[PDB]
Amino acid sequence: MFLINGHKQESLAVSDRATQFGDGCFTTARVIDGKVSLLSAHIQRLQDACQRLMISCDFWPQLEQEMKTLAAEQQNGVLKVVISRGSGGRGYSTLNSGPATRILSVTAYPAHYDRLRNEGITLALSPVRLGRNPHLAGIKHLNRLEQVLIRSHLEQTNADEALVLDSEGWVTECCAANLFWRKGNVVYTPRLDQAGVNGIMRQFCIRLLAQSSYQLVEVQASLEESLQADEMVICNALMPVMPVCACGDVSFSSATLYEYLAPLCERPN
Amino acid sequence: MFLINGHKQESLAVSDRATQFGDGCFTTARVIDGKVSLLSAHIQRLQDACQRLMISCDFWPQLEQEMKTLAAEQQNGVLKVVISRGSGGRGYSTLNSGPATRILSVTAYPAHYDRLRNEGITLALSPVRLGRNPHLAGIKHLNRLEQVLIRSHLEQTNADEALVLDSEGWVTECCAANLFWRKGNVVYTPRLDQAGVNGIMRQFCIRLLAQSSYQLVEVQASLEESLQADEMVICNALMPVMPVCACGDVSFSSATLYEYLAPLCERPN
């Protein structure tokens, strides 16, 4: 069951530009004890995506009400929101298209997470490299074929997530998560101005690390640099943080950064 | 009205992965006097896209029947076909998803084309540059946000189409068309192994030029190189070929290549 533009609908107009061109954005949020974690960050990230895509909406307070109501019904799980440009326009043009579509739905919280939390994550280098385009970088938009292909190659391994580089060879992210690595007291994360999704949990963690005694640096780094880390941690709104036992035959022995972030993200704070 | 998986439907399951991730491909074909032009090239391009996307279908003869029937009804116009992975799968994974969705529809032939044919096309350099990813290059897939943004920037000019470069600065294509340029007897077109859509009309034209006395070269070229041409021509299944009067304040004086290709593409051959 989905709530589309305010009422229950199982299907959507075929002409919707989400269906035709992926013309839109989305978020996935954690629901715990009836409430959306990080609710204002999720509204803000959707607002930001729509602005960069020129999708003008004024339904924000209604979308927020709807997210709260579905979260209270589901009680524990995942809430997914999609916003698209709507129908219309000639060819790719956005002229005369709209008004925007909003789609919400909720599911129970997935099993495998717990398993992964308690066993640790293995990473495998993806052969699929992300294109670089600052016009789309950072946004959680609907054009996610690159991630479908990354996931598909990942499944041919014994790895739980992927280490993903861009077309220039710079370490950018995972398949559906962001990446931090630590050497000593310095904690590194890729800059996402050319590719990648600037996740809600990534921003939360940067905030934490910024205020913490760790030093936090956003970099452009080669896979060889990243592999010399003492520790790797991955994150997304739902995990929210997971420890990395290895990326290939290179192993990581420490969990100190993980141990520090997990309690503050789980609440979250 | 759309024909979806064999029967008339106005709407599509919201969970369809076209809607969620743009997970699919499409074609747009010309209909003249009741028949699809270049019908087998359109089937072949869809087959090729689905193969590279790991979307397995065995409905091809039925899709071909359906395309013919809609073309006969519409008599003159445009036929659009979308194929998506279908619904299902956890997150981005394609495991347990499917079976594939096929969507067809037809519209009348658009007005402005004729106008553009008889007046000539003006091109404007796009500020939006295509990411490079050989895993998706060439395929007419549904992830077309880059083209929505290109179109949007184009509309802020007096240009009818865009000259589009990739992230390395190489001339790749237009917004919804492919690009040829001529210097002397040598005719150039960008190689589309890193970005771009390898259009049906582009392949037709390469076939023609290959057999012709012109010399045809697929290159990696800078915008400065391309701007020293004596002539530019753009193409897609629907135009099918258009002459270029200018790209900025640089003008083109000849139409010899256009004059040669237009009658053989209009039939088509």
Ligand SMILES: *Cc1c(COP(=O)(O)O)cnc(C)c1O
């Ligand atoms: C959603 C997503 C993330 C993480 O985003 P969060 O907002 O923290 O959930 C990271 N990478 C990709 C490719 C994503 O789709």
Ligand SMILES: *Cc1c(COP(=O)(O)O)cnc(C)c1O
């Ligand atoms: C569809 C399209 C073309 C031209 O494809 P044809 O098969 O000749 O119509 C060129 N570029 C883009 C970006 C396209 O979407």
